[PDB]
Write a protein that binds this ligand. Structure first.
Ligand SMILES: [Ca+2]
Ligand SMILES: [Ca+2]
Ligand SMILES: [Ca+2]
Ligand SMILES: [Ca+2]
Lengths: 372, 159, 90, 141
């Protein structure tokens, strides 16, 4: 129990932090990855002067603060502001004292060696956690779907990745990163919806375009004869009621937004798209392992939640793969937390105890120890 | 040092006296602190066989001065935490056992019937009112029975 | 849900067959033939009992492992009641 | 204003302690009795051996035993495994409770290191006189 209860799992994202206790089924804490700094001197009624704001209080009060994102494209870019988000996570969100809890953290696919050593330096030397561990994100997603070999298409708020994993070892030279994700996708909907003849003028109009994207957006299979369908004008249309009455209608654009993930050309991106990239990762891997990867395309991440994403991907890679092959696109329902759940499982596991980096290992080996 | 405080506050001269004698044998050279090696020797005399990793972890558990060694102070702290944990384990074990004795019907509970029996089984003189009263006070989830959790709580203190 | 039937076969048969040989491997080690046959006459005497003790040895352990599970089985019953009691979806 | 109520509580305590006190003394009864069952069971399943004559008997018996050994051993093994299975089942349950409550009292597995009382005895042998438990010490008279 000492640490059975006690292991923490913190998944640091570009848009959201997911956090909680190893053992739980889902994150106890989910909140924006921002750190707000007040543009002016003054106070809220009853509070003192605050130097900084994090998560939702930074979002809610955004009009008087300069908002900053510590993690650009999955990589920690500002370490002063990240130690601020961690502090908030332990002390306010989970309300635990960190110096008696083992902490499993996550990093990104080709996270620079030096960063994995730096967050270890900050975990052990400024938070004084007993022990910690850094798992790679795609690797926890895979594992949370039971398996050990597969290829994960991972897509969240600032990055998309393909991480081919074989008997647990993520394959460095076959990993692909595509910098277009849910953030890019909300801003494109924004324009095709203002372009539908609308105005997201006040900040209460801006924010909810993102809630339109999440609730009403679709990834149609045969996106071709779906536009064609749009035109005959079926009961395909969908009206959402705004903060007030102002019933906005979205028929068609509803799927023009996730067609951006297959066609980056919709947004002036010259890069290849999700399905081709799944494939290219795969023809960059060893030959003998390619049947395995093909029958185990595990999807994880908030942006892979658009319904019919899996069917489109299913047919997208069947038709690029040699017919002798078995294609299989696994997309679980909890996928917006796969990464986290994979960490919860792993860290609560009976056999993981012997991989925890302890302060004994650290004080004796330097940050190098956990770096592997 | 704050820990080394209550720690020494906890123990008695008697305690310290012996914990010292004990500490001294840990400390070979007689310098003033147990090293990652001085500890290893005693551990084996004590019948263990720790590994470098294991030893340090055991060391830096009470090494507040990041010395990588343990002084008679950091040591007393350590003895204390142990003293604590020991007594806790012994307690919960005993109670755990008591619950099985009182249960006997093995339904994992203790119903007003068994409670009466066991109570009446004591020498003490008691009337039904007493029994049902103790039940009502103990049964917090008001389900009639007394679960192990409740039993731990109810017996909390009693000897 | 019948595509999962092939999973039953593969899984069960798999694990069960794995368990078997292990048990065989394990049990085999702890076995030293009754090689000593017609090498002496009083040998049997000093031998027979040794086997006897080994048996008694095993027997006694089997009894303990047994009583143990029972005790554990009860730990469970209780540990389950604590789980339900600690439900309160409130 | 329930001035007397104080005596009511003390009673429950007086009784609770009458209970525990009862428990403990019953605890060792069951314990020893238990053992008794153990020696009886063993009493018949492997009674005070009596070495036979000399020729065929000693050999025969020896063969008899040796075969039983593989037998009992297998049983011993199967049992050990049903234990493993069990301990496993409760570890999982000892989880389904943690992340639903937190650290709770009496975990079934109990990771215990040797007691300080042990280490002290082990190291000083004779001179280790302190029935340590919790009782602090403050000047007598
Ligand atoms: Ca020394
Ligand atoms: Ca020291
Ligand atoms: Ca009962
Ligand atoms: Ca109850």
């Amino acid at each position: 129990d000492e640490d059975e209860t006690t292991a923490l799992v913190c998944d640091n994202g570009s848009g959201l932090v997911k956090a909680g206790f190893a053992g739980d089924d889902a994150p106890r804490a989910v909140f924006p990855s921002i750190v707000g700094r007040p543009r002016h001197q003054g106070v809220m009624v009853g509070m003192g002067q605050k130097d900084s704001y994090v998560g939702d209080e930074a979002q809610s009060k955004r009009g008087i603060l300069t908002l900053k994102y510590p993690i650009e494209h999955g990589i920690i870019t500002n370490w002063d502001d990240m130690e601020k988000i961690w502090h908030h996570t332990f002390y306010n969100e989970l309300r635990v004292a960190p110096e008696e809890h083992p902490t499993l953290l996550t990093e990104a696919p080709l996270n620079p060696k030096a960063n994995r050593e730096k967050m270890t330096q900050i975990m052990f030397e400024t938070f004084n956690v007993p022990a910690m561990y850094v798992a790679i994100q795609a690797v926890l997603s895979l594992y949370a779907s039971g398996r050990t070999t597969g290829i994960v298409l991972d897509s969240g708020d600032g990055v998309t990745h393909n991480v081919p994993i074989y008997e647990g070892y993520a394959l460095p030279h076959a990993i692909m990163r595509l910098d277009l994700a849910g953030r890019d996708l909300t801003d494109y909907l924004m324009k095709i919806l203002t372009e539908r003849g609308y105005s997201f003028v006040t900040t209460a109009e801006r924010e909810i375009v993102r809630d339109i994207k999440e609730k009403l957006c679709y990834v149609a299979l045969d996106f071709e004869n779906e536009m064609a369908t749009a035109a005959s004008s079926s009961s395909l249309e969908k009206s959402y009621e705004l903060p007030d009455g102002q019933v906005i209608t979205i028929g068609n654009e509803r799927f023009r937004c996730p067609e951006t993930l297959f066609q980056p050309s919709f947004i002036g991106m010259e890069s290849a798209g999700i399905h081709e990239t799944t494939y290219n990762s795969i023809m960059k891997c060893d030959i003998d392992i390619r049947k395995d990867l093909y029958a185990n395309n595990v999807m994880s991440g908030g942006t892979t939640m658009y319904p019919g994403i899996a069917d489109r991907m299913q047919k997208e890679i069947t038709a690029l793969a040699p017919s002798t092959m078995k294609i299989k696109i696994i997309a679980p329902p909890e996928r917006k937390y796969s990464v986290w759940i994979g960490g919860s499982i792993l860290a609560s596991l009976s056999t993981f105890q012997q991989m925890w980096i302890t302060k004994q290992e650290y004080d004796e080996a330097g940050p190098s120890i956990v770096h592997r | 040092t704050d820990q080394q405080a209550e720690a020494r506050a906890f123990l008695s001269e008697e305690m310290i006296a012996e914990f010292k004698a004990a500490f001294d044998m840990f400390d070979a050279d007689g310098g003033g602190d147990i090293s990652t090696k001085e500890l290893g020797t005693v551990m084996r005399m004590l019948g263990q066989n720790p590994t470098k990793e294991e030893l340090d972890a055991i060391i830096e558990e009470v090494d507040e001065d990041g010395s990588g060694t343990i002084d008679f102070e950091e040591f007393l702290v350590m003895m204390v935490r142990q003293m604590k944990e020991d007594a806790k384990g012994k307690s919960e074990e005993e109670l755990a056992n008591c619950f099985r004795i009182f249960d006997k019907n093995a339904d994992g509970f203790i119903d007003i019937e068994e409670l009466g029996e066991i109570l009446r089984a004591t020498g003490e003189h008691v009337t039904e009112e007493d029994i049902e009263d103790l039940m009502k006070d103990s049964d917090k989830n008001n389900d009639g029975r007394i679960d192990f959790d409740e039993f731990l709580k109810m017996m909390e203190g009693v000897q | 849900s019948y595509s999962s039937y092939l999973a039953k076969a593969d899984q069960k048969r798999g694990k069960k067959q794995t368990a078997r040989e292990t048990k065989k491997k394990v049990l085999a080690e702890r076995r030293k033939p009754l090689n000593i046959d017609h090498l002496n006459e009083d040998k049997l005497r000093d031998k027979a009992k040794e086997l006897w003790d080994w048996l008694y040895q095993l027997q006694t352990e089997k009894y303990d492992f047994a009583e143990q599970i029972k005790r554990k089985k009860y730990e469970i019953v209780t540990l389950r009641n604590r789980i339900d009691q600690a439900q309160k979806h409130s | 204003e329930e001035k007397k109520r104080r005596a009511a509580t003390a009673r429950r305590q007086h009784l609770k302690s009458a209970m525990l006190q009862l428990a403990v003394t019953e605890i060792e009864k069951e314990a020893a009795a238990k053992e008794v069952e153990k020696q009886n069971y063993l009493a018949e399943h492997s009674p005070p051996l009596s070495l036979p004559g000399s020729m065929q008997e000693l050999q025969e018996l020896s063969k008899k035993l040796h075969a039983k050994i593989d037998s009992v051993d297998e049983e011993r093994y199967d049992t050990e495994v049903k234990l493993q299975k069990t301990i496993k089942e409760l570890e999982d349950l000892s989880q389904k409770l943690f992340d639903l409550r937190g650290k709770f009292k009496r975990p079934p597995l109990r990771r215990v290191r040797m007691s300080a009382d042990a280490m002290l005895r082990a190291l000083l042998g004779s001179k280790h006189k302190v029935n340590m438990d919790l009782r602090a010490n403050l000047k007598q008279v």
